[PDB]
Amino acid sequence: TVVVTTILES
Amino acid sequence: RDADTKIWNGMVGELVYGKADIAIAPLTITLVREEVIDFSKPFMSLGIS
Amino acid sequence: RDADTKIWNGMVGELVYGKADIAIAPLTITLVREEVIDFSKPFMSLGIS
Ligand SMILES: NS(=O)(=O)c1cc2c(cc1Cl)N[C@H]([C@H]1C[C@H]3C=C[C@@H]1C3)NS2(=O)=O
């Protein structure tokens, strides 16, 4: 499973 | 990069230390970041406005 | 690239074959060019106007 790391911003 | 500790924190520091495989993020391409990890071609343009 | 003889032409053709070490040019980053020769991040932005 490829891990996507994101930050929470509109 | 925290300057004295020379550790990367955040989404890049997750990509550096092997925890994550990719990041699709509002992550601006920077010379200090380009030395430590790879980037794709940018997908969206932005400037000071 | 024209597939009549499947031969590259121009500056990229000099890049692929061996005549060119680098092509600093108005050379638009595309897909069929990226597959055969490398591009960096684009140094100048533009569009159809
Ligand atoms: N002023 S400009 O339009 O020539 C221009 C164009 C561009 C600049 C900077 C300038 Cl000043 N840098 C951007 C940025 C995206 C990545 C490639 C170069 C930096 C990181 N690319 S761009 O879109 O090719």
Side-chain angles (χ1 to χ4, degrees):
Chain A
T1 303
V2 177
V3 176
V4 179
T5 180
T6 59
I7 197 168
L8 194 148
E9 184 175 359
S10 297
Chain B
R1 187 177 65 243
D2 189 70
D4 52 354
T5 316
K6 291 174 95 288
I7 53 99
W8 291 92
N9 53 4
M11 295 183 289
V12 175
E14 188 175 359
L15 287 176
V16 169
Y17 294 157
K19 293 173 69 177
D21 298 330
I22 195 170
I24 299 98
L27 192 66
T28 178
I29 300 168
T30 313
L31 182 61
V32 295
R33 289 170 176 173
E34 180 63 29
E35 292 179 353
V36 296
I37 60 168
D38 196 0
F39 283 94
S40 69
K41 281 91 178 67
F43 60 92
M44 186 176 64
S45 178
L46 77 167
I48 296 172
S49 64
Chain C
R1 183 181 60 83
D2 48 349
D4 51 353
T5 58
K6 295 180 180 292
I7 297 298
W8 294 94
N9 58 3
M11 299 184 288
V12 176
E14 293 184 353
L15 289 168
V16 173
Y17 294 161
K19 301 293 187 293
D21 289 329
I22 196 167
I24 298 172
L27 193 64
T28 307
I29 301 172
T30 59
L31 186 66
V32 294
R33 291 174 184 176
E34 177 64 25
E35 189 178 3
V36 292
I37 45 92
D38 288 326
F39 287 103
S40 70
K41 279 90 178 66
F43 61 94
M44 188 177 71
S45 176
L46 49 96
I48 300 172
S49 64

